[PDB]
Symmetry: D2
Subunit: 313 residues, 4 copies
Amino acid sequence: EDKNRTNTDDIRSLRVITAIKTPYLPDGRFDLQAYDDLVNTQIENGAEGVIVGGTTGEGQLMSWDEHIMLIGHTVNCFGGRIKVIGNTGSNSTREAIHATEQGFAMGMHGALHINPYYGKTSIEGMNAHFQTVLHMGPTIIYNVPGRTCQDIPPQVIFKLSQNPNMAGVKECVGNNRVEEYTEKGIVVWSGNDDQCHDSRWDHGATGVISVTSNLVPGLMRKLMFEGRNSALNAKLLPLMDWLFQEPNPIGVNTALAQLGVARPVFRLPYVPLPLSKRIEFVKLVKEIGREHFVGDRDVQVLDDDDFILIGRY
Amino acid sequence: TNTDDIRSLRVITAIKTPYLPDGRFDLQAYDDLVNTQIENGAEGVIVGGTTGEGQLMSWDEHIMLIGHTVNCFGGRIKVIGNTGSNSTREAIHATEQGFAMGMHGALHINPYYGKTSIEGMNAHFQTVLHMGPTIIYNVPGRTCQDIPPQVIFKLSQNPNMAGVKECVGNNRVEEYTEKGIVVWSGNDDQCHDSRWDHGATGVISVTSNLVPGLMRKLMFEGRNSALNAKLLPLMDWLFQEPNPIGVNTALAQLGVARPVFRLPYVPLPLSKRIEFVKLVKEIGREHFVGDRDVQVLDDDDFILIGRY
Amino acid sequence: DKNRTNTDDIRSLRVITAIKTPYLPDGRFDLQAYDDLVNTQIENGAEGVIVGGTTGEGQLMSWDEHIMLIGHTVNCFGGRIKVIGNTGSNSTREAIHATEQGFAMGMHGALHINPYYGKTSIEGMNAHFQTVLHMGPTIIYNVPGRTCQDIPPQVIFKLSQNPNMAGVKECVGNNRVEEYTEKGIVVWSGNDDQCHDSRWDHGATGVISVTSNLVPGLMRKLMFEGRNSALNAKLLPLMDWLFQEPNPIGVNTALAQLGVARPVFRLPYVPLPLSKRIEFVKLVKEIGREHFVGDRDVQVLDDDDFILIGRY
Amino acid sequence: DKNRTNTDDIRSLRVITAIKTPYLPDGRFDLQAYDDLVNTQIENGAEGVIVGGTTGEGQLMSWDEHIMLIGHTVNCFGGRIKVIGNTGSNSTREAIHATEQGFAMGMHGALHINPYYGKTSIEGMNAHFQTVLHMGPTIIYNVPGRTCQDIPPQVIFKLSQNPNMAGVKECVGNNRVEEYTEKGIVVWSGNDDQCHDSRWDHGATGVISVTSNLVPGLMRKLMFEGRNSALNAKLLPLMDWLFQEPNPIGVNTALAQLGVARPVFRLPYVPLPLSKRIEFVKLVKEIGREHFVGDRDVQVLDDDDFILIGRY
Ligand SMILES: N[C@@H](CCCC[NH3+])C(=O)O
Ligand SMILES: N[C@@H](CCCC[NH3+])C(=O)O
Ligand SMILES: N[C@@H](CCCC[NH3+])C(=O)O
Ligand SMILES: N[C@@H](CCCC[NH3+])C(=O)O
Ligand code: NA
Ligand code: NA
Ligand code: NA
Ligand code: NA
């Protein structure tokens, strides 16, 4: 219980957690060299944790053997330099139990657990689901009703918070929901890049589980550590708007290809933003400055035929 | 003529998947449920739909259950595999295996949780539309993404697009049927009006799991607002928690499925099970599946399984 | 009485083809090519098929592929041929699961090998078979050259007490065949070059055959029309060619040369070399092309026609 | 340079334990029991562990169990012992995926058997091994008693051209061991009852051991402190008892009797009978309980203490 306590507190103290993009080879297999370069770039620019195969990491498109491999690989290669949080959540309790116990057995520092999506359940069912995995180790509960189509209500979060393994909540409902939890001492990470500044400084959020940190990790570190900076927050808004004009991770996948740090390979059902938006992206990089974005290569527009779409991989 | 056989079906049951106490499929109980559907005029079955808890299956057990259903019943009923996924890879592999097992058609949802652009949604459906007769499934209450009319009209030009399982409501159903697209209502409490007022071919039904004879009557024997009003309390009871919590609880009370739930589903509470006994008596037990007297059951009768 | 006839339906089969699983260029199943192979077997008097046996590369399938191929075969051909799923495993857990799923697909029977690589005690071997023998008609497969463990007579005799034990696919030789057939146990020879003598001199019911993949008509003649030392001697050069490397290397090469399977190998199998493919053209000319499956002129094929897949 | 160092780090190991995988009463892995077994090996001078080898029942594992156990062993013990994953398979697809996943998760080496049951040609064996050898330090496993196919010297000589081929786990005997060691190829004996003479008289580097599961200190002494024919002779009755039925039946029974694993077997393995367990208690007394793993007095155990799992 003393080790469990320290383990949970080591997650609660994290302010910058990157929902890391999973890059691919031309045949659709994981590009582990590109992935390792992405994680090293996050560490060098002050990311304190990584979600492995989150929504941004396309965990939804992995086989369990790929997903478990990427968790174990990240622990083995980077576990001493960053906290590794496996997205071992599922709409199936059986899948969540097996994936979470395997992830913890291979040394991941915490688990991200969404409520069941598509196959939505009752409040009693939601509690039953979370109770099967909460005992296994430090857990972040993920409320994203725009994707799950089911709000995790405060009554569920308050009951789960009775368990010392509940590290906190990745909250997407907004700053009023954030404040309801943080005023009661529950740790909250904003899941909304365009709200995380106000969440952090005005509503008691500990930090952010970020998509945008994939592109500008240094600026997101600054936003979470160095106090209110409404000017920097305003300067990042056009980039955050561009990143979410189509569902995540279409934007981050397109951007990382343009910056030359991931191959222009998409696993279906994702397809890149079209030419006009890629031209907009080069303009956004020029306005902020290329030096703030990951990678060293000059940003490219890329041609339509540079992109590879993989269904069977 | 494969696709035209699907297009003529008016009663398609989203069949419940029953379990043994260790959480494995109860294939004996499953066969008994499908046989009862065939005897009471069900014309098709969705295997591992939302009601069938496909979302809780391994692909191993989902494709097995499709193959089992084709072997046992394929000559007596149209077998539509729910081979859809939020992952294009999973949808491709499940659909080609389902068609290889001999299923008559596929049900395909738009990607849920990992939602995509219109262009990505089109790309997803195109990987599976060429494999055989396909019903497109629109349920924005569960996917949190409406398949817009623009997409359905474009998909409907593909001769393998049988039609739409539509859950938006009767205005959406009518927008499609008036433009010659075949529509099954996905909403039991709307399907009567859908069928008789809005050009729906029929229903892909949860309630037919409980009262298959009454649902066939509702789709075939003409407009009957009195029979429809008679079923509304039962339909309201079945959807007070998300499907399939209601049907799982009801089939346990009727004795045709064991009171075994795969998590994250748990039964309706005692007060609702007491109300179910009253709903059965009001409609008449003879109209519900099974021969056993309806039991309330104790909370401690229900087995909740996470590890199966 | 209901189960008795299902097992008796298997016991009466004389020609069971261990059917080859053909592939498309990236290593996925070629179901069109497979269906054509099975139809050819039926048309030429094969009475059963083993789905994903040693010849069918069941050892290279995932269980989802293997159970799909069984269900596909039952649905498409189950009324025209007896479908025996190779649902055996060196893991009891895998054998139980695969056998249950196979019978749920409607397969007529199961083929069960003793545990290979992870060999066990006589008591362990009996425990293994007892978990699956109750599920339906079962053929017990003894192939000590592959398993490195003989299923001894004492085990076959104990298994024989269960009515679901249809018989034995025996590879030890015609002396072991006779030890069983003289006690009323049904035996299929698993050795194409012994099956004639097994059938006519040692009371074997018939063969579970590799060679029937190429010349199903001639293997049917061999098992049905009586003693024919001339026909048996005529087939021996083809049988020697098919088993010069471990099965199914020969049959995979031959079916590609005859144009009824694509020249796609799942590793760790690779084709016979050009010298053997030239010999095969000569063997076909000597027997006559009309006796071999397919209508295309037999080809040698270039080394570069053969696609070797690891990531299947 | 890092690859040369990683390979040399495997080549220097003299005592590698083929660690037993212990189970909970329902058949799932007992990770608490496993962690205690690995700790005991480290404390008594084991330098490497095979995860899910023949002894570890890799043959009865699902891949998710097998990969988890490799990743768990690296995470908990990888700084204190070399972790060699048994990521081999008779299927090249299984071997490729398991091996790349095991190396991605930080295993130090891979153990690769030639394809068993589905045996292939020499050319096929080479093609199989070439798909995995480039992925990291590799021990080639020759056990013709289980595979029913000798990996011939020409295959080992060819693989030894690759800087990732660490060496050979050889079971054919001391003549084959010497054909490799005389050329500077690293060999571990796979035969506990030969490994003493193999180490001191035939140039073997050490042993990949079953017996080290029971007496790790005595096996370390045998591999490091020079010829000791007396100690080797003192161990022979124990080694004879451990292999009277196929491994791991003996080690599974012994570890239950020493109280360091539950008396739980995955089929098709079943324990040695009562008379053999009585013989074990006598063997432990003659050698001395202090040399065997665990602190608890050795127990005979009753027949009904043992649990046999089919659906694990
Ligand atoms: N596509 C499925 C399976 C993903 C499994 C690996 N995370 C889902 O989103 O639930
Ligand atoms: N739970 C996953 C996998 C189900 C796969 C079998 N239908 C999902 O809902 O996407
Ligand atoms: N390669 C494994 C798995 C095959 C499973 C499908 N038959 C074996 O030969 O046991
Ligand atoms: N029982 C199969 C599969 C084992 C997979 C895990 N090592 C075999 O021995 O090949
Ligand atoms: Na995430
Ligand atoms: Na459905
Ligand atoms: Na066979
Ligand atoms: Na080993």
